[PDB]
């Protein structure tokens, strides 16, 4: 007979976050923004197998791009059969450049995290048998297996975070800070403790699609087989909020535009600095723990402060960006900070920005 729904334990801010990051509208919006045909690929129909077939088709395309084999056209057509796209019921375009191939890999990585959020929400048999259920938002929070604590104005780190955001965000249209949560994804702790000898820790921005926030809270920042970009197959961070905010896909809610950004503690250790793009990188050179694509600018190092997190000092930039004359000819306007092991980052904060 009828189960009791227990009252929600969550504060309003956290309720809104959990509503947003599991929202079916949000997920379908994201799919439409990536040109996917949501009518032929509904959320409940997404499968790991379908996604795996999509990567196989792109793998075949990539081989063709590097025979008497199938044309890029034919191979593209196969991809589009496996992963339905919407282009106003015109033909979808051929995947015939490295840039576009990577764009499709990135779409599929986002889609794989949407599928993860759907799988996560599957109702277990224990939940079918208990006579009282948590409020749906408590249930969704619990699935993350990630502790979130909303911070108020006088948490020790609050002003330091706000200063990082303000001093390194866009000069004309800085994102407006609404909330900060401390993030404790346990199961990150053990692997991150591995690098406690490794110095040079920095708190760095990671901006993303709203649609991958649940996945990240569940599994941490990840390097996937088809990950790539201007500095290769790693996890990308920025020291300038404005660089990371470029990757934030927010969603219109009422009269404003809501977005989420992370701050991670990154054990950078011995840095290798580059000044030109290298998409082929899969690790730092021998003897180095990270790769920094150095920008024309950097938050003024003289203003760096520190936080203490789990008894370690973590550098937090507090300065506006200034020119770095040694990197004035860099192919990078702003720095990209790369690690190539998922263990070298721990999620620390999540921010809601408008
Ligand atoms: C679009 C694919 C997506 N990656 C991201 O959301 C990271 C985006 C991002 N890139 C950066 C690049 C340089 C500097 C900073 C950033 C950043 O803050 N976010 C992704 C989603 C799921 C699984 C792996 C990767």
Curated annotation (Swiss-Prot):
Q: Does the keyword Membrane apply?
A: no
Q: Which GO terms describe its biological process?
A: DNA ADP-ribosylation; double-strand break repair; double-strand break repair via nonhomologous end joining; negative regulation of isotype switching; negative regulation of telomere maintenance via telomerase; positive regulation of double-strand break repair via nonhomologous end joining; protein auto-ADP-ribosylation; protein localization to site of double-strand break
Q: Which domain of life is it from?
A: Eukaryota
Q: Subcellular location, in the record's words?
A: Nucleus; Chromosome; Cytoplasm, Cytoskeleton, Microtubule organizing center, Centrosome; Cytoplasm, Cytoskeleton, Microtubule organizing center, Centrosome, Centriole
Q: PARP alpha-helical domain: from which residue to which, for each copy? A: 7-122
Q: What is its EC number?
A: 2.4.2.-
Listed A to Z, the keywords are: ADP-ribosylation, Chromosome, Cytoplasm, Cytoskeleton, DNA damage, DNA repair, Glycosyltransferase, NAD, Nucleotidyltransferase, Nucleus, Transferase
What quaternary structure, including any partners, is listed in this protein's UniProt entry? Interacts with PARP1; leading to activate PARP1 in absence of DNA. Interacts with PRKDC. Interacts with XRCC5/Ku80; the interaction is dependent on nucleic acids. Interacts with XRCC6/Ku70; the interaction is dependent on nucleic acids. Interacts with EZH2, HDAC1, HDAC2, SUZ12, YY1, LRIG3 and LIG4.
The entry's protein name is: Protein mono-ADP-ribosyltransferase PARP3
Organism whose genome encodes this protein: Homo sapiens
